Design an enzyme around this catalytic site. Structure first.
Site, PDB file in Angstrom:
ATOM      1  N   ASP A  88       0.853  -1.148   0.247  1.00 47.68           N
ATOM      2  CA  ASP A  88      -0.312  -0.500   0.133  1.00 47.68           C
ATOM      3  C   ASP A  88       0.441   0.931   0.107  1.00 47.68           C
ATOM      4  O   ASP A  88       0.362   2.237  -0.509  1.00 47.68           O
ATOM      5  CB  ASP A  88      -1.175  -0.166   0.748  1.00 47.68           C
ATOM      6  CG  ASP A  88      -2.602  -0.045   0.472  1.00 47.68           C
ATOM      7  OD1 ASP A  88      -2.831  -0.131  -0.041  1.00 47.68           O
ATOM      8  OD2 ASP A  88      -2.601  -1.431   1.902  1.00 47.68           O
ATOM      9  N   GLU A 143      -5.271   4.071  -0.610  1.00 46.70           N
ATOM     10  CA  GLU A 143      -4.044   3.211  -0.046  1.00 46.70           C
ATOM     11  C   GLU A 143      -3.359   3.953   1.094  1.00 46.70           C
ATOM     12  O   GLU A 143      -2.837   2.930   2.095  1.00 46.70           O
ATOM     13  CB  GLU A 143      -2.398   3.026  -1.202  1.00 46.70           C
ATOM     14  CG  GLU A 143      -3.631   3.219  -2.440  1.00 46.70           C
ATOM     15  CD  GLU A 143      -4.083   1.584  -2.271  1.00 46.70           C
ATOM     16  OE1 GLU A 143      -3.883   1.340  -3.689  1.00 46.70           O
ATOM     17  OE2 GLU A 143      -4.870   1.199  -2.102  1.00 46.70           O
ATOM     18  N   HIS A 145      -5.248   3.022   4.112  1.00 41.93           N
ATOM     19  CA  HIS A 145      -5.130   1.704   3.825  1.00 41.93           C
ATOM     20  C   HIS A 145      -3.856   0.970   5.022  1.00 41.93           C
ATOM     21  O   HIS A 145      -3.941   0.551   6.374  1.00 41.93           O
ATOM     22  CB  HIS A 145      -5.050   0.843   2.955  1.00 41.93           C
ATOM     23  CG  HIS A 145      -6.537   0.647   1.568  1.00 41.93           C
ATOM     24  ND1 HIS A 145      -6.178   0.769   0.739  1.00 41.93           N
ATOM     25  CD2 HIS A 145      -7.578   1.240   2.214  1.00 41.93           C
ATOM     26  CE1 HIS A 145      -7.308   0.333  -0.580  1.00 41.93           C
ATOM     27  NE2 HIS A 145      -8.752   1.129   0.894  1.00 41.93           N
ATOM     28  N   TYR A 187      -3.255  -0.029   9.070  1.00 39.07           N
ATOM     29  CA  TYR A 187      -2.269  -1.492   9.753  1.00 39.07           C
ATOM     30  C   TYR A 187      -2.040  -1.293  10.865  1.00 39.07           C
ATOM     31  O   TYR A 187      -1.285  -1.968  11.726  1.00 39.07           O
ATOM     32  CB  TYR A 187      -1.597  -1.941   8.474  1.00 39.07           C
ATOM     33  CG  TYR A 187      -2.003  -2.572   6.909  1.00 39.07           C
ATOM     34  CD1 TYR A 187      -2.482  -3.759   7.362  1.00 39.07           C
ATOM     35  CD2 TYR A 187      -1.509  -1.790   6.084  1.00 39.07           C
ATOM     36  CE1 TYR A 187      -3.181  -3.817   5.280  1.00 39.07           C
ATOM     37  CE2 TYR A 187      -2.051  -2.197   4.868  1.00 39.07           C
ATOM     38  CZ  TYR A 187      -3.423  -3.672   4.744  1.00 39.07           C
ATOM     39  OH  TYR A 187      -3.489  -3.777   2.862  1.00 39.07           O
ATOM     40  N   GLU A 226      -2.648  -5.050  -7.501  1.00 36.71           N
ATOM     41  CA  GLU A 226      -3.730  -4.785  -6.619  1.00 36.71           C
ATOM     42  C   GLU A 226      -4.645  -6.131  -6.569  1.00 36.71           C
ATOM     43  O   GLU A 226      -5.839  -5.764  -5.520  1.00 36.71           O
ATOM     44  CB  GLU A 226      -4.863  -3.663  -7.615  1.00 36.71           C
ATOM     45  CG  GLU A 226      -4.829  -2.565  -7.531  1.00 36.71           C
ATOM     46  CD  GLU A 226      -4.430  -1.320  -6.671  1.00 36.71           C
ATOM     47  OE1 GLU A 226      -5.063  -1.575  -5.328  1.00 36.71           O
ATOM     48  OE2 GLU A 226      -3.789   0.019  -6.607  1.00 36.71           O
ATOM     49  N   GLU A 261      -9.583  -2.348  -2.740  1.00 38.25           N
ATOM     50  CA  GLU A 261      -8.683  -3.111  -3.843  1.00 38.25           C
ATOM     51  C   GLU A 261      -8.770  -3.888  -5.061  1.00 38.25           C
ATOM     52  O   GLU A 261      -8.837  -3.998  -6.289  1.00 38.25           O
ATOM     53  CB  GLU A 261      -8.010  -4.073  -3.230  1.00 38.25           C
ATOM     54  CG  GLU A 261      -7.008  -3.829  -2.046  1.00 38.25           C
ATOM     55  CD  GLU A 261      -6.069  -2.230  -2.053  1.00 38.25           C
ATOM     56  OE1 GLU A 261      -6.731  -1.418  -3.102  1.00 38.25           O
ATOM     57  OE2 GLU A 261      -5.479  -1.954  -0.933  1.00 38.25           O
ATOM     58  N   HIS A 269     -10.326  -1.244  -7.397  1.00 42.40           N
ATOM     59  CA  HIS A 269      -9.364  -0.443  -8.116  1.00 42.40           C
ATOM     60  C   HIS A 269      -8.439  -1.121  -9.044  1.00 42.40           C
ATOM     61  O   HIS A 269      -7.780  -0.819 -10.049  1.00 42.40           O
ATOM     62  CB  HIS A 269      -7.773  -0.023  -6.987  1.00 42.40           C
ATOM     63  CG  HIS A 269      -8.428   0.332  -5.980  1.00 42.40           C
ATOM     64  ND1 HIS A 269      -6.743   0.945  -4.999  1.00 42.40           N
ATOM     65  CD2 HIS A 269      -8.760   1.471  -5.477  1.00 42.40           C
ATOM     66  CE1 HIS A 269      -7.774   1.861  -3.746  1.00 42.40           C
ATOM     67  NE2 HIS A 269      -8.697   2.163  -4.440  1.00 42.40           N
TER      68      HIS A 269
END
Ligand SMILES: [Fe+2]
Ligand SMILES: [Fe+2]
Ligand SMILES: [Fe+2]
Ligand SMILES: [Fe+2]
Lengths: 287, 287
Positions: B62, B93, B96, B100, B161, B195, B198
C-alpha cells in the site's frame, strides 16, 4: 524497501495534519445549490459572466494541483507520513474541482458550461500563470531531483494554494457576504478551509528543505522565490483588471490578492512584501 | 490548458468509479480492534508471527501504491476524469496503510512493531517483489512516456491490486472465518472492497491504451505481461513457503494466490493462466 510506520513518528506535525485533513472531509453531494437560482437571476449578465469565469480559473488551478502539484511533490518526499498527507490533499483537490462542476450545473446550461471551459483552455493569462507553476512541477519528472528543485516546486505549490486562488475566491465570498449565492458560498468556504491547511503544510515542508540546502543554494532559491512572487503578481493584476473592470471591483480584489500573497510568504517563513490592508468587510462577512 | 469538466464525459466509466470510491470511503477510527485481543492471545507464537509479517508486507505494498503507483500513472493520463479517480484511489491506499498501524497498536508493543518494520525493510523477497513492480512505475519519471511504458505500469498496478496483496490477505481472512481477530478482519474486508475496484478501474484504463498500440507493440507488451505474471509467481511461491510453512498453510495460500492472479488477468481482459479451483471455504466465510 520501507513501509510507512505510524508507530514511529517521522516528524512532529504530519499526524496532526493527517487527522485534520480527514476531519475536514466532505464531498459536493452534501450541499445542494439549487436554491441559489433565486439570487443568481437577480445578478446582471456582467456579474454572472465574472462569476463563471472565476470559477473556471479556480477549476483549472485545482486540476493542476491534484494532477501534478501534489503527486509530483509527494513522489519525491522521503518522509512517508508527510507523503501520506499530500496524497490525501491531492485527492481533495479533485473533490474541489468536481464541486465547481456541481455549481456550474445549477448556474448554466450544458452549452454555456462547455463555453466556459473553452474560455479557460484558450485564456492567455490563465495559460501563462498555470504554465509558470507547472513548469516547477514538471522539473520533477526525473528519477532523482535536487533539493533546490524540490524546494522551488514547494514554493510554487504554496503560491498556488495561498495566493493564486484568491483573485477567484474573492467574488463568491463577496456575493455570499451580501446574501447572494450563499449555497455556492458554503462550498467555496469548505474549499478555502482545505486550501488554507494545504498551504500551511506544504510551507512547513518547504522550510525544512530550505534549511538543508547549502548557503549557495539558499541564496539562489531565495532570489528565485522573490522573483516568482512578483512575476505572478504582474499576471494577477492583469487578470483582475480583465475580469473585474466590468463590475467595478478591481482595486478591491487587488487588495485581497496582496493580503493572501503575504499569507503565502508567511507560510514559507518569509516576511510580507505588501503593505498591510484590512480585509474588505463584505468579503469578511462572506467568510 | 484544460480544466476538468464533469459536464462533458471523457469516458463511460469514470463517473461511476468516482461515485463508488466516495461511497466506500472509510477511515480506521470507525473500527476499534481492542476486542481482538481475546483471540489474539490464544494464537500460538508461530501464528502471531505469521500474522504480523503478512501485515507488514501488506503495509509495504500500500505504501508503494499510494506513493508511486497511483501518482505516476495518473500524472501521465490525458483523461482528467480518470486522473481524478486515481488520485482518490491513491489517497485510499494511504488510509489502508495507516489502518495496518492501527491494528499493530493493539496486537504488539512499540518495540515489537518497530521490529516488524525493520524485518519488512530488510526482507529480500519483499524487496525483490516491490522492486519489480516499482521499476515499471519509476520508468514514468520523465516528461514523455510511450504507450507501452504506461500500459506496463498499469499492468504492474493491476497485478499489485488484484494479485500480490492476496498472499497476505489470506491469513486475516482465514482467521476471521473461524471467529478469530474478527475486527481486524472487518478492516481487511474494507481494504479488499477498495482494492477490488482499484484493480478493475486500472484494468479498464490499460485495455483502452492497449487498443491504441500497434500490433507489434501489442505483441511486445503481451509477452512482457505473461513473463511478469510468472516472475511474480515464482517470488510469491517462495514468500508463501517462508511465511506459512510453520503453520501448515502453504498449499492453501498458493491456491488463493492463483485464484487472484486469474482475477488480475481478467481485469486486464486476458485469459486465466491457472486451473480453476474453489476458494478455501474458511477464507470464503471470512469474506
Ligand atoms: Fe483545492
Ligand atoms: Fe489545495
Ligand atoms: Fe490499498
Ligand atoms: Fe488499491
Amino acid at each position: 524497501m520501507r513501509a510507512v510506520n505510524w508507530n514511529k513518528k517521522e516528524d512532529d506535525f504530519s499526524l496532526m495534519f493527517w487527522k485534520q485533513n480527514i476531519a475536514q472531509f466532505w464531498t459536493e453531494e452534501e450541499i445542494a445549490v439549487s436554491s441559489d437560482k433565486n439570487t443568481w437571476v437577480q445578478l446582471s449578465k456582467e456579474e454572472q459572466i465574472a462569476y463563471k469565469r472565476v470559477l473556471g480559473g479556480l477549476t483549472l488551478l485545482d486540476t493542476k494541483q491534484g494532477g501534478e502539484g501534489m503527486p509530483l511533490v509527494l513522489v519525491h518526499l522521503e518522509n512517508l507520513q508527510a507523503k501520506s498527507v499530500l496524497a490525501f490533499m491531492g485527492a481533495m483537490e479533485e473533490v474541489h474541482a468536481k464541486s465547481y462542476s456541481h455549481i456550474f450545473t445549477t448556474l448554466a446550461t450544458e452549452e454555456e458550461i462547455d463555453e466556459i471551459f473553452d474560455w479557460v483552455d484558450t485564456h492567455p493569462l490563465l495559460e501563462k500563470k498555470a504554465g509558470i507553476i507547472t513548469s516547477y512541477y514538471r522539473r520533477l519528472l526525473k528519477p532523482e531531483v535536487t533539493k533546490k528543485e524540490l524546494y522551488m516546486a514547494m514554493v510554487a505549490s504554496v503560491f498556488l494554494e495561498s495566493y493564486l486562488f484568491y483573485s477567484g475566491f474573492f467574488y463568491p465570498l463577496y456575493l455570499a457576504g451580501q446574501g447572494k449565492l450563499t449555497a455556492s458560498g458554503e462550498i467555496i468556504n469548505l474549499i478555502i478551509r482545505d486550501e488554507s491547511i494545504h498551504g500551511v503544510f506544504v510551507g512547513i515542508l518547504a522550510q525544512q528543505i530550505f534549511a538543508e540546502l547549502s548557503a549557495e543554494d539558499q541564496q539562489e532559491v531565495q532570489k528565485e522565490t522573490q522573483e516568482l512572487l512578483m512575476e505572478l503578481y504582474e499576471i494577477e493584476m492583469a487578470y483582475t483588471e480583465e475580469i473585474y473592470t466590468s463590475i467595478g471591483l478591481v482595486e478591491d480584489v487587488n487588495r485581497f490578492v496582496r493580503y493572501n500573497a503575504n499569507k503565502g510568504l508567511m507560510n514559507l517563513g518569509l516576511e510580507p512584501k505588501f503593505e498591510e490592508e484590512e480585509i474588505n468587510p463584505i468579503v469578511l462577512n462572506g467568510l
